[PDB]
Amino acid sequence: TRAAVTVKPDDHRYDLLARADNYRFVAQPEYFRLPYSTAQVVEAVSEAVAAGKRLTVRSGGHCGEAFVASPDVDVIVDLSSMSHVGYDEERGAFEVEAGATVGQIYRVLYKNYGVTFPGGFCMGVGAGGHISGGGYGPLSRLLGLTVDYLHAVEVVVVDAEGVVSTVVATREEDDPNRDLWWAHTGGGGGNFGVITRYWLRSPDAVGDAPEEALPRPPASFHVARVSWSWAELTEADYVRLVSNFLDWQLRNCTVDSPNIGLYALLECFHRSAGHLAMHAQIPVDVPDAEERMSWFLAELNEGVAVAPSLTRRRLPWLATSQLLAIPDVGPGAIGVRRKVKSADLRGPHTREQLAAAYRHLSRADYHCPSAAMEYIAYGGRVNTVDPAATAVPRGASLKTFYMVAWTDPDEDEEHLRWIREIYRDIHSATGGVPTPDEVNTGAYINYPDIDLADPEWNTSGVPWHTIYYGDNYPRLQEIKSRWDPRNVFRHAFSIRPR
Amino acid sequence: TRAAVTVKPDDHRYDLLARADNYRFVAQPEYFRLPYSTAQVVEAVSEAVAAGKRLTVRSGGHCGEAFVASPDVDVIVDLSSMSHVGYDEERGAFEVEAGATVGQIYRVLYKNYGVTFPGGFCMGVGAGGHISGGGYGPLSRLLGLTVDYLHAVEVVVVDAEGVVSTVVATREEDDPNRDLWWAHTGGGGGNFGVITRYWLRSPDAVGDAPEEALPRPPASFHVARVSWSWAELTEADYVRLVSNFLDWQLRNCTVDSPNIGLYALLECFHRSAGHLAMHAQIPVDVPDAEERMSWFLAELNEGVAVAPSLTRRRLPWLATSQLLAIPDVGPGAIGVRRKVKSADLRGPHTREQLAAAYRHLSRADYHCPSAAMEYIAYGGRVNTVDPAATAVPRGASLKTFYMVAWTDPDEDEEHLRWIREIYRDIHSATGGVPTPDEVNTGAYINYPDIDLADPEWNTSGVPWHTIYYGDNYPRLQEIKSRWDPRNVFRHAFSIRPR
Numbered sequence: 001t002r003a004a005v006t007v008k009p010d011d012h013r014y015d016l017l018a019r020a021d022n023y024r025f026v027a028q029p030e031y032f033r034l035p036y037s038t039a040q041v042v043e044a045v046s047e048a049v050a051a052g053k054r055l056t057v058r059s060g061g062h063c064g065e066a067f068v069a070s071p072d073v074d075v076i077v078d079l080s081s082m083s084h085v086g087y088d089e090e091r092g093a094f095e096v097e098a099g100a101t102v103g104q105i106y107r108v109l110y111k112n113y114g115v116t117f118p119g120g121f122c123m124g125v126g127a128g129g130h131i132s133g134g135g136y137g138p139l140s141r142l143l144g145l146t147v148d149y150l151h152a153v154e155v156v157v158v159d160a161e162g163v164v165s166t167v168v169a170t171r172e173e174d175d176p177n178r179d180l181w182w183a184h185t186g187g188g189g190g191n192f193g194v195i196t197r198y199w200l201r202s203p204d205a206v207g208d209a210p211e212e213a214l215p216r217p218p219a220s221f222h223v224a225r226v227s228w229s230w231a232e233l234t235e236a237d238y239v240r241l242v243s244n245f246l247d248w249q250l251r252n253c254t255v256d257s258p259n260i261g262l263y264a265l266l267e268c269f270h271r272s273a274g275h276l277a278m279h280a281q282i283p284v285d286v287p288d289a290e291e292r293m294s295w296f297l298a299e300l301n302e303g304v305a306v307a308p309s310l311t312r313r314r315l316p317w318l319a320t321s322q323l324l325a326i327p328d329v330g331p332g333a334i335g336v337r338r339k340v341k342s343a344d345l346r347g348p349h350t351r352e353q354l355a356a357a358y359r360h361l362s363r364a365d366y367h368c369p370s371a372a373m374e375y376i377a378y379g380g381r382v383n384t385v386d387p388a389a390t391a392v393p394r395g396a397s398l399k400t401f402y403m404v405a406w407t408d409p410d411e412d413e414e415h416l417r418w419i420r421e422i423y424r425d426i427h428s429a430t431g432g433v434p435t436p437d438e439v440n441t442g443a444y445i446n447y448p449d450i451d452l453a454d455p456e457w458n459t460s461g462v463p464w465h466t467i468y469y470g471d472n473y474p475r476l477q478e479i480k481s482r483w484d485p486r487n488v489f490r491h492a493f494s495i496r497p498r
Numbered sequence: 499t500r501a502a503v504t505v506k507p508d509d510h511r512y513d514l515l516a517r518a519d520n521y522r523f524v525a526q527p528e529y530f531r532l533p534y535s536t537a538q539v540v541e542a543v544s545e546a547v548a549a550g551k552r553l554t555v556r557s558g559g560h561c562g563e564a565f566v567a568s569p570d571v572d573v574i575v576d577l578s579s580m581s582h583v584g585y586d587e588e589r590g591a592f593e594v595e596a597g598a599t600v601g602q603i604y605r606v607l608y609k610n611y612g613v614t615f616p617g618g619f620c621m622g623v624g625a626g627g628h629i630s631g632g633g634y635g636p637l638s639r640l641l642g643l644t645v646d647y648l649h650a651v652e653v654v655v656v657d658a659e660g661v662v663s664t665v666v667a668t669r670e671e672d673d674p675n676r677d678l679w680w681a682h683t684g685g686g687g688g689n690f691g692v693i694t695r696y697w698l699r700s701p702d703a704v705g706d707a708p709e710e711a712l713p714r715p716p717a718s719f720h721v722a723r724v725s726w727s728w729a730e731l732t733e734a735d736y737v738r739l740v741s742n743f744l745d746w747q748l749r750n751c752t753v754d755s756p757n758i759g760l761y762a763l764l765e766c767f768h769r770s771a772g773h774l775a776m777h778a779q780i781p782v783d784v785p786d787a788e789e790r791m792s793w794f795l796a797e798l799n800e801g802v803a804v805a806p807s808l809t810r811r812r813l814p815w816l817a818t819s820q821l822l823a824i825p826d827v828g829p830g831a832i833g834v835r836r837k838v839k840s841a842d843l844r845g846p847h848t849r850e851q852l853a854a855a856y857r858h859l860s861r862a863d864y865h866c867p868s869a870a871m872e873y874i875a876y877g878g879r880v881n882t883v884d885p886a887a888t889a890v891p892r893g894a895s896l897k898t899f900y901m902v903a904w905t906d907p908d909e910d911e912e913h914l915r916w917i918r919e920i921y922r923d924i925h926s927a928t929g930g931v932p933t934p935d936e937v938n939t940g941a942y943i944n945y946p947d948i949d950l951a952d953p954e955w956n957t958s959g960v961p962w963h964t965i966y967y968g969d970n971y972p973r974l975q976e977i978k979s980r981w982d983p984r985n986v987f988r989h990a991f992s993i994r995p996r
């Protein structure tokens with residue numbers, strides 16, 4: 001193996017490595033280390049540990065916050081050159097190096113073996129942060145979460161006397177490292193050590209051919225793409241439309257629903273974007289698939305005056321997945337400053353919550369065509385899992401996501417103000433945040449938001465860690481204390497040892 | 499390694515594999531063969547040769563025409579699982595397997611080694627088609643063409659008895675197979691054999707460290723992105739703006755220019771789109787770089803009544819390249835029907851030609867936001883090499899490019915009609931095609947257009963092979979007869995033996 005690359009501030013590459021998906025956070029370490037093998041990750045961590053240096057890891061660069069790129073980080077280990085994806089016959093599982101990106105993973109697994117696993121739809125997202133935090137996407141209703149396929153993980157860890165090792169932790173019942181496995185099923189990136197690779201396999205796979213080791217997705221899908229012109233919207237129409245979407249999703253979010261195969265995402269962009277958009281997809285092989293999609297669209301439009309433009313077509317799965325995917329290049333990906341938020345639902349928003357959203361999404365005093373809240377269908381196979389079995393919170397029927405993206409740092413204050421205000425107004429009855437209760441079930445650690453730990457925005461009394469992990473947090477602390485007892489791996493929202 | 503994959507029509511992967519960048523052309527072979535090594539590509543070709551099957555190769559699926567997917571193709575060898583990029587210490591050059599995509603090549607080369615090669619901007623374009631056809635991009639004015647770095651090429655070939663073998667052909671003067679190397683420096687894909695891998699290296703490189711074997715791009719670029727509204731854009735404006743663009747490019751298209759680092763692309767969309775668009779870039783370490791972009795923009799708009807909305811910023815090279823690249827996923831990339839055309843220039847379009855483009859670009863009886871023609875700056879270092887030394891015709895100082903993309907197969911005739919009529923009417927003085935002369939240099943093999951072989955659109959009497967290859971065609975024909983004597987590798991625009 002070629003020796004690990006070290007990139008110092010005098011090297012031309014440093015300024016590029018300092019930048020990832022969020023341009024608000026530019027890293028300035030003493031150096032970037034790019035390793036090629038697990039033994040080089042060991043060496044990198046042990047150097048940092050010996051001299052007390054603050055170390056973080058980057059896989060895909062998609063962190064919503066400054067977890068990797070904090071100005072007090074001294075060393076950044078970038079895993080983008082460990083991206084192998086292959087079947088491992090000794091284990092009967094697909095091996096995925098942590099710097100592989102989801103888009104590449106889907107292509108390799110599918111073309112070479114005809115299988116897939118249910119991760120997210122954004123292309124440049126790294127396996128490192130995605131899987132460990134409880135990755136989901138469009139196939140989750142049918143197949144569950146990424147972590148439901150996590151057979152094993154290999155992790156570089158640091159014990160109380162500064163000794164660095166590489167351990168493989170599996171889900172087998174007698175695995176002495178089982179706890180470290182469980183922590184990676186929703187505990188989140190940057191907490192327990194450097195994940196070097198994951199192994200993926202269905203827990204009920206038959207034999208050991210790769211073609212049976214993970215699920216075959218359905219072969220093709222009816223896809224609907226719908227938009228409603230903002231120029232034609234009223235408050236009442238907005239309220240009614242989102243209510244219909246929500247009501248239909250809450251009736252159809254269990255594995256018993258004959259519509260469980262229908263996945264849909266409603267993007268409510270701010271008015272400056274020109275439209276509200278939705279994409280929906282259903283496997284062709286579901287009984288009456290095409291009629292099911294028609295009933296769904298007709299229900300959506302009941303009692304709503306604006307008529308949508310609609311295109312319907314049929315595509316193979318992988319193409320359906322790339323249609324909906326977010327690009328890793330182009331003006332939407334590169335040089336973009338961002339803020340994201342998250343809130344999960346097991347119940348409908350109220351008419352008052354939706355009128356408040358409408359007030360923020362129609363504001364004519366703001367202009368940002370990439371400002372949006374999104375409602376994302378969820379549930380299904382996700383919620384048939386015993387929730388003790390993984391570290392991811394379960395029970396939401398629907399996720400919601402808030403985002404503003406812009407390019408000018410001059411404008412930071414007004415974009416941050418806009419996203420904070422809409423999210424707080426929506427959650428004004430619960431101290432401005434989704435406190436776990438009858439309607440909210442929390443938030444998703446892979447859409448982190450540090451305003452949850454800010455007394456000016458979170459006036460609920462409920463700490464951030466409850467919001468993101470609910471009842472799994474204290475077990476995560478204990479596993480943290482066992483495996484990273486010096487708190488070498490940390491960030492604003494890292495598991496505190498206890 | 500793993501045995502090669504065979505995908506027949508009963509396999510769920512077939513419908514996906516049958517679909518590439520252009521949905522107008524759906525492949526229907528007997529099977530797809532996905533090989534993992536050169537030996538397996540030999541086996542695949544030997545099977546098709548033995549039974550006289552019509553065989554084609556796919557790398558990235560970016561062909562503008564049906565050369566891969568044509569219905570008479572029986573076997574398609576898909577190289578997407580051969581996408582290794584690394585330095586090959588033995589030959590002193592970067593090894594690029596034919597199935598690697600340019601997006602991934604630039605990331606690997608730059609991050610691991612701090613180097614690059616001047617290829618194209620589109621992400622999912624495959625090395626196989628791209629390099630052999632004579633790839634270019636944004637850095638070509640400073641660095642030349644991809645083929646200028648082509649140190650060697652490995653090709654699976656078939657002799658007159660139908661024996662299949664592998665040859666490595668190099669650029670070295672004593673190489674007995676130099677002729678095969680030269681044919682790959684612009685002869686285009688799908689002619690001589692299956693390219694399994696390329697080796698890339700500067701001809702003048704010092705020593706044997708990878709960091710020195712290809713050029714380091716400039717670390718940072720000033721970037722400008724510009725758009726003019728169609729709202730009150732008039733013929734007069736349109737014609738002044740492009741003339742201004744062209745005058746400028748033509749004065750500053752040589753290695754003597756202190757503006758040669760300035761690279762710019764003008765997109766003239768149909769009124770449908772709302773705007774005309776332009777992106778420019780210049781390295782940061784060019785003396786007075788920031789001011790030169792100011793001068794360039796000033797001259798552009800002189801005598802032009804629409805005021806351009808403008809944004810300027812500074813980025814690292816690799817970020818700059820990903821900003822202006824075209825995504826390989828999302829609505830712009832997936833499930834899209836396309837038609838492309840091209841014409842290179844050695845001198846300016848006349849006022850009449852521009853009037854004719856304006857008319858077609860303004861035509862209110864047509865709707866297609868994706869319809870455009872583009873002026874892409876070119877020349878510079880490209881034109882300091884001997885036109886003999888590679889198979890790519892050189893001479894153009896500027897490249898032009900035409901495209902319509904849509905999704906509805908029912909609208910094919912309207913979109914084809916538009917692109918065909920605008921192209922014809924701009925070349926109406928020369929029989930509807932850019933005949934090599936004082937002002938036109940031809941067209942580019944990697945933007946193929948079978949309408950140049952259609953008596954109804956090409957009335958110039960100049961055959962397609964002269965437009966694409968000028969003086970180099972007879973030599974290509976001779977290499978073709980020597981290396982593919984049975985014409986195994988062919989398509990509509992393949993080199994005809996003789």
Ligand SMILES: *Cc1cc2c(nc3c(=O)[nH]c(=O)nc-3n2C[C@H](O)[C@H](O)[C@H](O)COP(=O)(O)OP(=O)(O)OC[C@H]2O[C@@H](n3cnc4c(N)ncnc43)[C@H](O)[C@@H]2O)c(*)c1C
Pocket residue numbers: 021056057058059060061062063064067068079098119120121122123124125126127128129130133134135136137188189190191193194195196326446447491
């Ligand atoms: C940008 C982006 C993010 C998305 C998108 N869509 C998603 C979807 O459809 N479903 C999802 O479940 N999530 C989606 N996300 C959110 C992402 O899942 C998160 O942004 C992930 O956390 C990103 O992972 P990664 O790209 O690896 O980002 P990094 O910034 O490098 O790291 C995040 C976090 O994890 C730690 N970490 C990374 N790598 C490691 C390893 N190997 N070992 C330990 N820890 C690691 C980092 O230190 C950091 O703290 C769609 C889009 C466009």
Ligand SMILES: *Cc1cc2c(nc3c(=O)[nH]c(=O)nc-3n2C[C@H](O)[C@H](O)[C@H](O)COP(=O)(O)OP(=O)(O)OC[C@H]2O[C@@H](n3cnc4c(N)ncnc43)[C@H](O)[C@@H]2O)c(*)c1C
Pocket residue numbers: 519554555556557558559560561562565566577596597617618619620621622623624625626627628631632633634635686687688689691692693694824944945989
């Ligand atoms: C879609 C697309 C194309 C682009 C884009 N931008 C370009 C740019 O910025 N600079 C360029 O110089 N060219 C650009 N092009 C055009 C592409 O260069 C061409 O479209 C390439 O030919 C595409 O290559 P590839 O993606 O490999 O396409 P295929 O469809 O697989 O094959 C093309 C042609 O080549 C033969 N062939 C492929 N692979 C091989 C191998 N290994 N050996 C021999 N022959 C091969 C095929 O049979 C076919 O004949 C921007 C965009 C978005």
Ligand SMILES: OCc1cc(O)cc(-c2ccccn2)n1
Pocket residue numbers: 021062063064065120122326338340401403446447448
């Ligand atoms: O998964 C939805 C989504 C879409 C998007 O454009 C961006 C993100 C995102 C971006 C950064 C951190 C977390 N999520 N998520």
Ligand SMILES: OCc1cc(O)cc(-c2ccccn2)n1
Pocket residue numbers: 519560561562620824836838899901944945
């Ligand atoms: O090279 C410019 C460009 C842009 C684009 O969106 C598409 C293409 C293209 C698409 C198919 C075949 C050849 N070129 N080219």
